[PDB]
Design a protein around this ligand. Structure first.
Ligand SMILES: Nc1ncnc2c1ncn2[C@@H]1O[C@H](COP(=O)(O)OP(=O)(O)NP(=O)(O)O)[C@@H](O)[C@H]1O
Ligand SMILES: Nc1ncnc2c1ncn2[C@@H]1O[C@H](COP(=O)(O)OP(=O)(O)NP(=O)(O)O)[C@@H](O)[C@H]1O
Ligand SMILES: Nc1ncnc2c1ncn2[C@@H]1O[C@H](COP(=O)(O)OP(=O)(O)NP(=O)(O)O)[C@@H](O)[C@H]1O
Ligand SMILES: [Mg+2]
Ligand SMILES: [Mg+2]
Ligand SMILES: [Mg+2]
Lengths: 308, 308, 308
DNA sequence: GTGACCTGAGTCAGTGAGTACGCCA
DNA sequence: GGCGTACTCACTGACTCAGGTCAC
């Protein structure tokens, strides 16, 4: 957490610091991730303070050509502890690749919210369970968040108390504004919420309800792309696992197809697939990942705890 | 391959040469390549100083009319870094020419970063396997550069695990402005070396999330043109391949076209479309190349690297 | 044509002829075309000197009216260069005409470079079959010169060998001032030897990438007008077939119009819109030509060249 | 042979750029 | 297999002539 408040000590005007904090941006990394074009439109920042803040931000962080040795060493802060029920974290080697946009693009009845609760609990798994991690956020656009499931999966992982594992943000969207403000206040600049989980339950569901037809596609997807960029910037800020879900559409043209299309196809790092099949048990895929190979898995929910 | 300070050794004022060095010109070609307008825009340079700088620059480097057979004998050595797949480096004649800019685009899960990952390693190779006898300076904006592959690459090529990572230069470049900036830092830090492959993985991932909406589109494409022209400058200046990769959007008629419009369409020399095929096997196509004919590959993304 | 120092040997003092030799006036036709306002601003020459050199040049070069009947005699023996395709041949009424500016624009992968490459070899074919029997100059601005593709054309028509790469002269413009300066250097290489093609592989790519905004819009259109003026001077004093190449831009208001605006739109006698057709086969439609219809035709790019 | 004085009058336009964005049984 | 809508960007500079009137 290297925020705009620590930027004050660098010699930056306090008034401009607060007038940037009142905007979306909250950290030196945030402005260093935005052009001069985005800084030019903040009222009270006029074409000179923006540039000098750009130079100060560029000098403050080592945002230059490295050799990636340090990048592999930074891989150590990143843990994939998605245990689930069976064959998670073994065949699906990367369940939570912190710093990457995991995307459970799946189907109804195939346990996307259930696995989201599992993921939220596992991101709170202590150091003894293969690494201890924090928790910062949960978006509930479709209004399906039952912390009773959190308690049930807590008992699965050996957690007696689930109120400690109660996710720090039960925010909801109600519309396409993707909960603008929480990305801004919850920039996770405190001492907690480091290597946390940022769940967006049905991130682009509301983009389907509110935004409608071809007449609103451009605005819908540009809003979506700005939102996904905000997610990616949040992930780049320290390290956080951006785990989102998504629903399928039906290809009447002549069986799942992306919703959000190529914006979410390219934005998300490790995109994922879920299937029901036969019996109670359901199948997944390992689908997109620059590191993992295509494969399938095998899992089932229980009442006293859930896998995938 | 002649450092800019050598013009000072000719007799040009030391203050002028250093102020040009921090002006974005780090080779005797950098000053010669640009027009007088950019040199004039530099602080401390008048019209006369710029004119004498241009004359002394044109004195050294041959800006003349060499017959096409001279260029053909220059074309005997092209290096043509191999791809790793027998069919892929057969569709490409010998590979990809060094000294021209190549672009790879496709939908998700098409192995653009896979081709980059298994084609940058093939540059720090003896020419016996179509190597380049150079290094890499992979630049990557989305963080698709997952280090697990980055250190699981080297088991097939015949090289140790130490001298693959130690021969790449990775930064992030999480801005539209940071792309050209990183190009400048790369030029000034790699003039004193012998590189064979500069990779700009996602040239246009950052020209969507950043410059949102029309009206803001023209500045987006002007910045893209600036970046692409400086990119092309690194080809004549250092004789390297500068492979970039692209993305797609749904061309809603009311399904596959590259982003960047007609600015990335023209600057690129060779354009490769990667598409998911029947099963794990991929399909590559020659979209837009000056010498290469249109044909399809069938390369398969294997664990060691792109094979067939 | 006659070189600059022809009447000077018995006329003006050789010193001022060598003084104006730096100003890029390497033929007495060029001095004839010269405005007095553009000769007062060069060093050495006074009012009386400028007037006397202009009177001498006007004595050497015809300047007034001429009955269109005799100019029809000139136009009946001009040479039209074969394009390399049989169907493009009749479409362009004998192919690319000489002594005038021709401009083919289009999106990528439309074969604009490919037609120029085949034009560079068909520049040397005999008078009974090919275009002008002369050395082909290839001022190139994108680096997409492929001598290999030149050869494949040489196998056809039975002019194989590197004897076609010796005739072709290849420059490489690196900016706008230099692309303009290269026409001063190219000015003297055509008064001493026969050249029959003035391919500027992209007339406007560097204008697009050099002058950034709207503040530079008046400047760049002025400079481009000057460049097209010297192009027209070359075309109408050497009788070379200038073949410039234009890119495209996308209309956002409502769909691909060429870049350059009302300057190059008016100042490019013949315009072609090459468009991709189906498969490997592309289409060439006429856009703006004062003497041939606005139809559209067919062609394709093979491993041999741009033929059927 | 001696002996300086007095400011008026405005002008004349030019240059286009730049695509995005899936949907539904 | 019948489905549309979205707008903002700016800098440019060189220019000349004209005179004529007196007494102590
Ligand atoms: N506690 C449980 N025990 C066993 N099976 C369960 C349990 N909870 C849910 N399930 C099963 O898992 C499915 C959950 O599907 P899920 O995709 O999470 O629901 P949804 O309504 O599609 N939510 P979302 O996809 O986030 O919009 C249910 O339909 C049941 O078949
Ligand atoms: N070890 C491996 N063995 C086999 N296949 C692998 C292996 N690692 C990666 N792959 C495959 O390579 C594919 C390419 O990854 P991909 O999703 O294209 O990365 P990306 O190019 O960064 N994504 P995008 O930007 O959407 O193209 C994966 O989906 C796997 O199918
Ligand atoms: N040997 C060949 N055989 C057949 N077709 C070929 C061959 N070489 C190139 N082509 C075709 O020519 C196309 C390229 O045309 P080109 O003239 O390079 O377009 P351009 O618009 O000038 N390129 P850019 O630099 O992106 O503007 C390729 O996409 C192929 O379709
Ligand atoms: Mg469900
Ligand atoms: Mg890919
Ligand atoms: Mg071309």
């Amino acid at each position: 957490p290297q925020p705009i408040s620590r930027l004050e000590q660098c010699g930056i005007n306090a008034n401009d610091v607060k007038k940037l904090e009142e905007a979306g941006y909250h950290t030196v990394e945030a402005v260093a991730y935005a052009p001069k074009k985005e800084l030019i439109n903040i009222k009270g920042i006029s074409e000179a303070k923006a540039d000098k803040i750009l130079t100060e931000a560029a000098k403050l962080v080592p945002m230059g050509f490295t050799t990636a040795t340090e990048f592999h060493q930074r891989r150590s802060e990143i843990i994939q502890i998605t245990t689930g029920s069976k064959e998670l974290d073994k065949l699906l080697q990367g369940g939570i690749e912190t710093g990457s946009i995991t995307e459970m693009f799946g189907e109804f009845r195939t346990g996307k919210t259930q696995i989201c609760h599992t993921l939220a609990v596992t991101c709170q798994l202590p150091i003894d369970r293969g690494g201890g991690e924090g928790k910062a956020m949960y978006i509930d656009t479709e209004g399906t968040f039952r912390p009773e499931r959190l308690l049930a999966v807590a008992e699965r992982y050996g957690l007696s108390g689930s109120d400690v594992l109660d996710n720090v943000a039960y925010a909801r969207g109600f519309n396409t504004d993707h909960q603008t403000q929480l990305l801004y206040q919850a920039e996770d600049m405190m001492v907690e919420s480091r290597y946390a989980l940022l769940i967006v339950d049905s991130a682009t569901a509301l983009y389907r309800t509110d935004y409608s037809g071809r007449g609103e596609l451009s605005a819908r997807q540009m809003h979506l792309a700005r939102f996904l960029r905000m997610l990616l910037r949040l992930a780049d800020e320290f390290g956080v696992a951006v785990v989102i879900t998504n629903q399928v559409v039906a290809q009447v043209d002549g069986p799942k197809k992306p919703i959000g299309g190529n914006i979410i196809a390219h934005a998300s790092t490790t995109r994922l697939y879920l299937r029901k099949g036969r019996g109670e048990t359901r199948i997944c895929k390992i689908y997109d990942s620059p590191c993992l190979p295509e494969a399938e898995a095998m899992f089932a929910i229980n009442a006293d705890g859930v896998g995938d």
